Write a protein that binds this ligand. Structure first.
Ligand code: CL
Ligand code: CL
Length: 393
């Protein structure tokens, strides 16, 4: 008989915690759970405080994002799982590279259990009306831009944008890490030059909404895609469940839709993408390491992945079984290509492990905003990213 205390966030709004607990307790009825909800607004601080002074009150530590992971490892608050993973023979391949991404000097301290990655959503009505065939699961970014440009046009009610690049720097920058040659945390940002050029071209041509208009109006990407005036939307997989729900309620008018794989740069395999994660970990000072390790393995593995997926959340595991559960959700697009897009070839983290990530964000966002508003040239903006990040202390 053990009670595992599970530090987590947003208990009432997070549909998967309860069924995960009930599914595990069904097989191990002697293990019970006290969920400790520390809130999302500054979870990182709150879990840090709760792990101080060698405290053993917490067993299972949820990790919100990569910076939270990095902080916990720097503080020494979570157990190395390397040996456990190896002994249990947990196959890393269906995590798409995330295990390796989370390995810090040969050591892994969390098992990812949810991971959203980047894809493209498209509105079939806009393709049909223009007589342009639907996007495929093998598109280069040059092809994507050609299609966006063809779809953009019309007057009045006919007025359509071929695509929408949201105001986050990631919509422009992520395509630039997909070849594996650079990350967005280290060194010289010159590599981003063609990536900015293509985005600025789309904008200057009116094929996508302008960055300045999106910033001044604060228009969320969903509102325009819901309006039915956007052909193609590069966005994370989180938008799948949202689009499903809103098409059901009638708030989204883009009721004929699909997804495809993230476009790839020349010479990169289709389905190469970027991702965000949440993970589970064990308090270094837990007195119930065995029980905690078994639970976190369950959650991150196929059984937990099925439970997560049944709530309309993308688990970290990407397999045939997870794809079937996702694509069987009523409202999920029933074309073959959409289902095939659910398992990436390879996922890079949007932002690699780096202790200065939050400070880097500030430098990159400022320059991004200057470039996209035509206030600094691309070359000058990338120089500002390179020099600003170097100067972080
Ligand atoms: Cl390209
Ligand atoms: Cl993340």
């Amino acid at each position: 008989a053990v009670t595992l205390k599970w530090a987590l966030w947003d208990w009432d709004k997070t549909a998967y915690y309860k069924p995960l607990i009930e599914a595990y307790q069904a097989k191990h009825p002697n293990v019970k759970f006290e969920p400790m909800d520390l809130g999302s607004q500054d979870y990182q601080q709150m879990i840090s405080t709760q792990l101080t002074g060698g405290s053993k009150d917490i067993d299972i530590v949820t990790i919100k994002d990569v910076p939270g992971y990095t902080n916990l490892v720097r503080a020494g608050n979570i157990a190395d799982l390397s040996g456990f993973v190896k002994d249990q023979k947990i196959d890393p391949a269906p995590y798409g590279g995330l295990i390796e991404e989370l390995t810090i000097d040969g050591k892994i301290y969390s098992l990812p259990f949810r991971s959203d990655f980047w894809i493209v959503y498209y509105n079939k009505d806009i393709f049909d009306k223009a007589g342009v065939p639907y996007p495929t699961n093998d598109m280069t970014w040059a092809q994507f831009d050609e299609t966006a440009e063809k779809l953009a046009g019309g007057m009045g009610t006919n007025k359509t944008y071929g695509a929408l690049l949201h105001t986050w720097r990631s919509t422009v920058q992520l395509p630039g890490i997909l070849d594996g040659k650079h990350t967005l945390v280290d060194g010289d940002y010159a590599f981003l030059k063609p990536w900015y050029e293509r985005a600025l071209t789309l904008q200057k041509d009116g094929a996508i909404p302008s960055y300045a208009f999106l910033k001044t109006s604060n228009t969320h990407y969903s509102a325009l895609f819901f309006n039915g005036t956007i052909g193609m939307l590069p966005m994370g997989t989180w938008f799948v469940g949202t689009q499903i729900a809103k098409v059901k309620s009638g708030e989204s008018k883009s009721k004929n839709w699909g997804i495809v794989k993230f476009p790839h740069p020349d010479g990169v395999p289709a389905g190469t993408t970027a991702a965000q994660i949440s993970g589970l970990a064990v308090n270094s000072n837990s007195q119930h390491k065995d029980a905690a390790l078994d639970f976190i393995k369950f959650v991150a593995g196929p059984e937990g992945a099925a439970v997560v997926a049944a709530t309309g959340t993308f688990p970290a595991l990407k397999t045939a079984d997870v794809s079937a559960k996702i694509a069987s959700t009523p409202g999920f697009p029933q074309d073959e290509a959409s289902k095939e897009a659910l398992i990436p070839a390879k996922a890079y983290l949007e932002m690699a492990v780096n202790p200065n990530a939050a400070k880097i964000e500030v430098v990159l966002n400022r320059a991004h905003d200057a470039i996209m508003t035509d206030n600094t040239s691309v070359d000058d903006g990338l120089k500002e990213m390179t020099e600003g990040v170097k100067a972080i202390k």
